[PDB]
């Protein structure tokens, strides 16, 4: 149940200044395929990197030339292992029971800007399907949508627009599908 960190390794000892360390674990089909990447950055320049796909430290720029040699002679072992003790462990023992089970049902509302706006908000995860309908018939034109929007609070939102002429008696419907939903959500407008 404990989260392992990806460790920053010490460099050999030889106006604002910035340095960054990035530990990245990529997953595809569970833990079937895992990939670790470690980036060492000075200001905004990545000069040193470790990549599972390679298996060793490589200099990304002239600035990391010798850093690569040092980390390879000093940490190859400790580093390669993080693929399991960090990536595999964190995924299987901490993300599975939390983030990978989080489900937020979207809220759906239609408003009129002429243009109709279907607001699909506060859902999680990102996978979502939204389609417009006029009298039970799907709208094949005049449909635009904003990019998927990350609220930064673990919920997403997306606005789906529909250009139209509010001809009397017409019935518009916003169809929304999401893993959190038992059944699709449909909001109507007249």
């Amino acid at each position: 149940y404990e989260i392992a960190p990806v460790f920053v390794l010490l460099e050999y000892v030889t106006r604002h200044f910035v340095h960054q360390f990035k530990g990245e674990c990529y997953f595809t089909n569970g833990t079937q395929r895992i990939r670790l990447v470690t980036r060492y950055i000075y200001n905004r320049e990545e000069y040193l990197r470790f990549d599972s796909d390679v298996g060793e430290y490589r200099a990304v720029t002239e600035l990391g030339r010798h850093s690569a040699e040092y980390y390879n002679k000093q940490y190859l072992e400790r580093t390669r292992a993080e693929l399991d003790t960090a990536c595999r462990h964190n995924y299987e023992e901490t993300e599975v029971p939390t983030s990978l089970r989080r489900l937020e049902q979207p809220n759906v509302a239609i408003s009129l800007s002429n243009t109709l706006v279907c607001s699909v908000t506060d859902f999680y995860p990102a996978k979502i399907k939204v389609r417009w309908f006029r009298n039970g018939q799907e709208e094949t034109v005049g449909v635009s949508s904003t990019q998927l929007i990350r609220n930064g609070d673990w919920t997403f939102q997306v606005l789906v627009m529909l250009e139209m002429t509010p001809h009397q008696g017409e019935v518009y419907t916003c169809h929304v599908e999401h893993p959190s939903l038992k059944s699709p959500i449909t909001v109507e407008w007249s």
Partner: protein, 182 residues
């Protein structure tokens, strides 16, 4: 960028000087899981629920920060002391949910292209400072190594009321004001 079904950011550390400013966070699929409060020496989860099952020993974050403090001095020299270039932040304001008069909503201020990671994000209501009921995420890493940050303002919609997201940063001649209206 690389393709995968999921992506975890572990060990994410940032350190800079002068000022001894450091940060340690973890993210999953692009969202902050927690950051280690260097002062209090504690793990602060983005959402209450979080640290109820899984656990993170702050000790780790402090280690990486220290290691990064070590690395900064070396690389700084190595570069013959090349300073960081101040970027200009880009801010955008948008509501969390559809706006309805008298119904609790939240304005989100998204700030991107932040570098270095030092910044002042504040809110104004009818050009009057607002400090209560304001939340701010940690500095979140970008693929280009700059950062983005988000501030939140819980409010009650009402016509005419004017809201502003004020951003201040060394890479800004004059502070920026992003306005939003009911």
């Amino acid at each position: 960028d690389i393709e995968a079904d999921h992506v975890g950011f572990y060990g994410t550390t940032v350190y800079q000087s002068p000022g001894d400013i450091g940060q340690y966070t973890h993210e999953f699929d692009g969202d902050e899981l927690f950051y280690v409060d260097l002062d209090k020496k504690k793990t602060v989860w983005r959402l209450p629920e979080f640290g109820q099952l899984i656990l993170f020993e702050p000790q780790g974050g402090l280690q990486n920060i220290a290691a990064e403090k070590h690395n900064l001095g070396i690389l700084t020299k190595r570069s013959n002391f090349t300073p960081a270039t101040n970027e200009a932040p880009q801010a955008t304001v948008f509501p969390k949910s559809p706006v309805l008069l008298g119904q609790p909503n939240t304005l989100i201020c998204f700030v991107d292209n932040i570098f270095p990671p030092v910044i002042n994000i504040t809110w104004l209501r009818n050009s009057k400072s607002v400090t209560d009921g304001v939340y701010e995420t940690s500095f979140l890493v970008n693929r280009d190594h700059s950062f983005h940050k988000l501030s939140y303002l819980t409010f009650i919609p009402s016509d005419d009321d004017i809201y502003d997201c004020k951003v201040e940063h060394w890479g800004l001649e004059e502070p920026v004001l992003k306005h939003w209206s009911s």
